[PDB]
């Protein structure tokens, strides 16, 4: 909670989704395949957007749970499913004491949105239990994340094929672990698909490679693809390229470390990282990994000997880009005049309000929206799933053929070479570059989690770049994701006697 | 109504729990299981009461609808599951626009206590449509119960032995029918028992006979109890009986118009009737009957030959007994010391807030509480539940032979006599009653229905005479209802993965 | 066989086990999630390798069959489950009469080790059904296992994704047809993924090519793989490759039959034949072809015209590389020091005891363990499975896009080379090698499966042989490879579904 | 069914792991179930133990199950058991007996007389 200007979430995102709904309603209008065209059409339109807009289920459960004292306490929970037009519905779980049914069903909404902006074939879907996790032993925590596991079950919130949950604030490998036994072990025992019925796995219980780091590495090229366009950078008088640029992140969690691991590795430097008890500052830049050590082993990153406990938000330190990474509203009416930065990398779910929003495009700020920009955590997840799936990591079953293969082909332009050039040209070795050798056997699990990520994130990138001119939104990417979103929602409710006549 | 006694419908509920918890508390301690007796029993108790107070599951749905027309609409509706200490939840389905989750939620609590009242096996439930019948075709009323049926089905709130709905606000037997059917026809099409799934369906379709009339007849039952006691209508001043007693009703719809129809057949008479409208009024009574059928004439009841357009509240009528058989908070602070009548049948969930509650005391009316009084209807739902468990109409299978065996029965104590008492005696025939001959088959499914009612609402009477007693509540019924569900509820947490640590 | 040494099989399994067990032990501590690092971790490892030891379900069944006289005759059975870190449980079925609880459970306890060596996601599981094939009808046969699949399937010990069988000792396509018609048939019916019940299934019923040879190509590559590493053939003091070497299998079945058809097709010349009834013998070798004929004809390989009944057991005979391909204990204690051969490779599961083991290493015999060396079969069986699971033979799709993007591929290399010498060069045709002309369209079903073993065989080669020098384990190969199983089941249980640090 | 522990040397949030679990893994291999099979309480086992098993079988396998409960016998009479259940067998040994112990035919061979008023008895347990 900020104070003033601290909408309800869930308007907020329901706000941008009819800003965006506003500009492609003639679009939608245009290719209906309504027979009857004459503005009703229109209004089946907006009769279509009436329906995705509001969360089709929420099941909100109170249960008890035995502290380790012996005590009994009664903890609630809550489980939003957005949208169904595609069928595994998809989303995170927060362990927070700010989860509310408005919070749950704001970001239920985000994910079929981000979903949709990046390609993956997913209703959105999101939950959370209202407790502080610090305040509980690792004990109770399995005995909570197990509860709520088996009610969302029995109730039809958790399957492979009906709702995949995922890690979010407080919530990792650890608690998905949790989440898949406690369903593989009861209700799923005879599904040969009970593992992918949760993801950010442990890679050791059917997870996937990067999936940890996948959220800051999809923040790393979503920003990446932006900060390479020239056009965009212009306009923020800014060089394209990281190499000249600093940047601070609000949040040292599984997006902000990774952001900041990712973005340092490009040759930007971090000059500030915050976290709930403070920030801490150094213009020269904070390493990623000595920060991530001191982190582990102090609990904080306040006392950081190479840096300074910056005072007074890390929002307003003086950097290129900003990362909150933390979140939601953060960024309000009140702090947006004074942000610094050019480039707000919203890897946090719904990090600015709409009214900083409007703030951030007067001062010409680029506001590179969260539905596109951690979209990464999802589009990987979807690769775990989908491994869960086919029960086979990839490539095992191709790595030596292609080998041979790539080797026998390589081989054919040789002596097709040899025979025509004869003994006056001798032997005319064709062999693999050094980086073709890394490559000669195929794509491994983690080659297709890298390369798929990156072709996610770029191919999204440009159709917001393409919607952002058809409409002439400037620095407004936001409403160009949106755009986006709706246009390919809108598709699966149009098409036939779907929704038509 | 009101302005300023509008509690939130379910913290008032839990205010009833807790007035009633406070009063049993000694006794939760007293005849605990506990090994380890040091008050921490003590605490143990309260963290049973802290469970079963608030709801374990609600469901909020937004589905869309096709209406006549052709335009799409979004429509809203929940359904709560209180709790699950008895198996099969049970609850009715309200069609208004004043239903809210927290409407929903404290009608479903108010489920499992008046179950626990009256010894119905069942965990409470409701739902509720946000809707207003009134505004919509027959046919668009069914696409909305129909998708509300499989929208639940999918999510674990409806079927035979999970949760099973009835009738309560603007939803009867027609309701229940497509109900039944969708479910039977989908979900439950291999299920021995998928039509028991909801009660209150239409006898041709597996409903039971009485089940419109159960609560009307119930009311009339909960009241006769304590009309002739004596006791209590001497602290009222009133006579025992209903000869010589007038009554108002508030509501002439299922639970209204029959507490009116055997209120009436039993002498006493009803002075005033009230709907949405309006109300009508007649100090020398109306009759049910002719009132019906003008109601079902003209749709209404104001405009009736026979009575006079009341003006000014059917509430503060001038009669002994007050029937509210509307919706909730009818009763509040600022009416309250005008009711005129001494006795409050509470027909109605929650017609009185705890205010007019205090004020009615300190008046010396006595309130019914609803969680008794209105029993009647889950009483017979519970029996065509176990009729539909049972596939067999009461009686079918034994009719003949205890007719059979009643007139040997008697043959035998005629053989005994005459052949003691030889020619000198004649023959001593041994015939039986008009009553008894009526019973000489043995009970029909009417017989189980009408004797079964009365026995589970005489016996409950007692339960809630015998605790008022106890703990010295004079008129203070309520209080004294609560703690009997209670003492019952807290029967099975107390035993139910048991405990000595 | 021996007296002296004859051990419990379940024991010499587990002891195997034991032996790498405490070689990987610092390791298992080494990289321990533990929080408290303090030698609680070594317990906490030792609890973990006490969880995975003893099988978790065992299934003895005894039921009747109806003989072709008209008698009926009970038969018992037996389906060991030795571990479910791994959902599908995988493991053949062997038919006779000494089958018991403690074969079937070694048995299955060595399927997870191997398939964990071979990187099979598999739990081990193993089925014994205690008959003489030999006298059996047919129809006698099938009904047996078709009452088995229905009992097993009936207990949950049978499922595309709980428990997958195979063939094993006297049971093959025939049998394994069988058990999936009657699990799809019935239980599964309606399962997408009912033929991938069980595995070895005849190609035209959903199973897949060289599934048969499997084992026996297995044991050609494990065996290859070791032959030709100077270091190990030094140390034994042979020269590598087959070309010279000389080899005697004990067994003439689904396993010896094949891995003698294998070697033989590389130089290697097979001297000794053994079966039940006795041993056929030739120095200058024996036709894998010409025998088969003979068995196939004369139901036995006694009187092979091409070789004389040797006299005096098949595992003393002369030779290079001894097979043995038939039951467990075949080697012990008492002719261990007379085995004559430098490389015995276990075809078979369980052939050598401890004691032959340790007389094995002292007299510098190499043995190639047979949790490695026979995995042919369920490297092979996975493929299977996930060939049903993927409703697709391999290739099939992509044959025709393959095949031209190659030749686009190598045009385009022709036409950047004459576009770059002009006419001064000619036309320089890029045409695909002979070898690369088979491989133009892509892998098909047969290529992945000789692939993919291979790849199998050589990567799980490598390992154990990585591990024997960092243990410095000399030619006890079998201790380093039981270190590699215990490492990955290990791993498994280290993040596993609980949590503890 | 048997589990091999001695219970007195096991916390009751151990036997009560123990009994949950037991109940998983008979009830994941369909051995209990309403109508596949149905436990009860022997030695060193009983209205407790009973409940641990309902309540697992109920919150998970047969959470749609109309006769869920009916999983397993012996429990307690709050959750579904029936009166008398734990005295029904000694309550039966004394049936069983009194059947017999007032037959004469039969008393007269062991050379007493029938009814229990002038006999001792010793029970082991
Ligand atoms: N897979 C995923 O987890 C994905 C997450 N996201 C987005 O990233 C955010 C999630 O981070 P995760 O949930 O990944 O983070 P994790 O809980 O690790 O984040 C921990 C960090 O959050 C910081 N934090 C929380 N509140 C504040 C605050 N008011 N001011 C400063 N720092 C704060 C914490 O400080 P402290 O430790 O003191 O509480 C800590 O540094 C979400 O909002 C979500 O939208 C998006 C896609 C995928
Ligand atoms: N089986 C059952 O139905 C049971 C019902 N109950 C209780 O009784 C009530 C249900 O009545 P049902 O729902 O049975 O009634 P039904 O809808 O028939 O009741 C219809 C009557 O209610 C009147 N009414 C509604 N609101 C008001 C109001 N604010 N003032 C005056 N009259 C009003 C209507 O007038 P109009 O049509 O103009 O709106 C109409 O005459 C519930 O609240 C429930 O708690 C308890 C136990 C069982
Ligand atoms: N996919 C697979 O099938 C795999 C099998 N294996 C291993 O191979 C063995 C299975 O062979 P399958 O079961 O494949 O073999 P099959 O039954 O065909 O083997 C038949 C041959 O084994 C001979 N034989 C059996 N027992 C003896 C004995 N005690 N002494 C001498 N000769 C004997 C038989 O002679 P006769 O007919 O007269 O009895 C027969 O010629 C198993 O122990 C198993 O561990 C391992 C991995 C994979
Ligand atoms: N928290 C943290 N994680 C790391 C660090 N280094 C690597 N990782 C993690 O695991 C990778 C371990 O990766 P490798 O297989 O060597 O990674 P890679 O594909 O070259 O990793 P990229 O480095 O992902 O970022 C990432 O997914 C990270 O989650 C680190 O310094 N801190
Ligand atoms: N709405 C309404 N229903 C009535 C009336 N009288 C009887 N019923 C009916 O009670 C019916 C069948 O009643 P029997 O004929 O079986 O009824 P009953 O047992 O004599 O009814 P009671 O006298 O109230 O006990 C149901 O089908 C109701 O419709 C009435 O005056 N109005
Ligand atoms: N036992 C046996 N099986 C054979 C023989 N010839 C062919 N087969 C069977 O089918 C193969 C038929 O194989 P092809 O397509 O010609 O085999 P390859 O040419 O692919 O076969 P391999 O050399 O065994 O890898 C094997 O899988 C056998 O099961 C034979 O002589 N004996
Ligand atoms: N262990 C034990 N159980 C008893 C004893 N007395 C009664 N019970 C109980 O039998 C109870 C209820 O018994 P009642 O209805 O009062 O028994 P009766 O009065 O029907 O009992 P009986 O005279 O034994 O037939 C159960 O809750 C058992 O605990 C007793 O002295 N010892
Ligand atoms: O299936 C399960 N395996 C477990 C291992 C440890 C623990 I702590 C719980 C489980 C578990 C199921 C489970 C199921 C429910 Br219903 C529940 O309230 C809890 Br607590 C646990
Ligand atoms: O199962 C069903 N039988 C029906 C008969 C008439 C009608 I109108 C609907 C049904 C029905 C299922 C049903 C199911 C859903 Br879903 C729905 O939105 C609607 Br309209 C109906
Ligand atoms: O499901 C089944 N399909 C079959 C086809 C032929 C035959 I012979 C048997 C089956 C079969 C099931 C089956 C099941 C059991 Br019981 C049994 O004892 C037998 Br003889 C057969
Ligand atoms: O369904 C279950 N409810 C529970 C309540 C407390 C506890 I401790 C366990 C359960 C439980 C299921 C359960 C299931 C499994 Br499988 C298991 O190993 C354990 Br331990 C528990
Ligand atoms: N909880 C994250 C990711 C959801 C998912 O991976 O399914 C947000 O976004
Ligand atoms: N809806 C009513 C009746 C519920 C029922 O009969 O199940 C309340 O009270
Ligand atoms: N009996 C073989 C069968 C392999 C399989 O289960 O597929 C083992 O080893």
């Given at each position: ?11 907020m ?7 965006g709904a506003?500009?492609?309603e003639?679009?939608l ?17 907006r ?9 089709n ?14 005590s ?18 998809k989303?995170?779980i ?8 408005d919070e ?6 985000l ?14 879907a ?8 610090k305040?509980?032993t690792?004990?109770?925590?399995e ?20 709702d995949?949950?995922?890690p ?9 672990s ?13 599904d ?15 997870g ?5 780091s996948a ?23 800014m060089?394209?390229?990281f190499?000249?640029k600093?940047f601070?992140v ?20 971090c ?8 920030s801490?500052?150094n213009?020269?830049?904070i ?7 001191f982190?582990?082993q ?15 938000s ?6 290129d880009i ?47 929206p969260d ?10 997840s979807?690769?775990?799933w989908?491994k869960?799936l086919?029960?086979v ?16 082909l390589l ?11 004869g ?7 064709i062999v693999?570059t050094?980086?073709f ?14 390369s ?14 393409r ?11 936001r409403?160009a ?7 390919k ?9 779907v929704?038509?006549?």
């Amino acid at each position: 909670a900020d104070r003033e200007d601290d909408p309800n979430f869930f308007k907020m995102v329901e706000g941008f989704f009819d800003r965006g709904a506003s500009i492609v309603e003639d679009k939608l209008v245009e290719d209906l395949k309504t027979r009857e065209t004459e503005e009703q059409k229109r209004n089946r339109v907006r009769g279509i957007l009436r329906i995705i807009k509001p969360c089709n289920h929420v099941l909100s459960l109170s249960f008890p749970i035995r502290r380790d004292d012996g005590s009994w306490e009664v903890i609630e929970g809550y489980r939003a499913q957005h949208s169904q037009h595609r069928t595994p519905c998809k989303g995170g779980i927060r362990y927070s004491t700010d989860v509310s049914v408005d919070e749950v069903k704001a970001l239920a909404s985000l994910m079929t949105y981000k979903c949709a902006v990046v390609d993956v074939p997913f209703g959105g879907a999101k939950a959370g239990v209202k407790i502080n996790p610090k305040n509980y032993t690792d004990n109770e925590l399995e005995k909570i994340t197990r509860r709520f596991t088996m009610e969302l079950a029995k109730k039809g919130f958790i399957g492979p094929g009906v709702d995949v949950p995922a890690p979010d604030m407080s919530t990792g490998e650890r608690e998905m672990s949790w989440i898949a036994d406690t369903y593989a072990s009861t209700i799923g025992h005879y599904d040969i698909n009970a593992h992918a019925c949760v993801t950010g796995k442990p890679i050791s219980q059917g997870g996937i490679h990067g999936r940890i780091s996948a959220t800051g590495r999809g923040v790393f090229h979503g920003i990446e693809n932006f900060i390479n366009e020239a056009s965009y950078m212009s306009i923020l008088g800014m060089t394209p390229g990281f190499g000249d640029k600093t940047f601070a992140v609000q949040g040292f969690g599984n997006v902000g470390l990774h952001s900041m691991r990712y973005l340092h590795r490009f040759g930007a430097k971090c000059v500030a990282v915050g976290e709930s008890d403070g920030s801490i500052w150094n213009p020269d830049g904070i390493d990623p990994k000595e920060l991530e050590d001191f982190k582990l082993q102090h609990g904080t990153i306040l006392g950081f000997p190479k840096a300074k406990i910056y005072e007074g938000s890390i929002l307003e330190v003086d950097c290129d880009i900003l990362i909150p990474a933390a979140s939601e509203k953060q960024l309000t009416k009140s702090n947006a005049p004074r942000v610094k930065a050019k480039i707000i990398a919203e890897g946090a779910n719904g990090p600015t309000t709409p009214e900083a929003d409007k703030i951030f495009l007067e001062r010409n700020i680029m506001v590179i929206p969260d539905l596109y920009l951690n979209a990464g955590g999802v589009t990987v997840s979807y690769f775990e799933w989908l491994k869960n799936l086919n029960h086979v990591s990839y490539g095992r079953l191709t790595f030596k053929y292609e080998r041979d293969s790539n080797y026998h082909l390589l081989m054919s332009v040789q002596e097709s070479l040899e025979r025509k050039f004869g003994k006056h040209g001798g032997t005319i070795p064709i062999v693999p570059t050094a980086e073709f050798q890394d490559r000669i056997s195929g794509a491994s699990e983690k080659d297709i989690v890298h390369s798929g990520l990156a072709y996610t994130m770029e191919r999204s990138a440009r159709q917001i770049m393409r919607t952002a001119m058809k409409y002439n939104l400037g620095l407004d990417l936001r409403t160009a994701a949106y755009v986006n979103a709706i246009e390919k929602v809108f598709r699966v409710y149009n098409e036939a006697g779907v929704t038509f006549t």
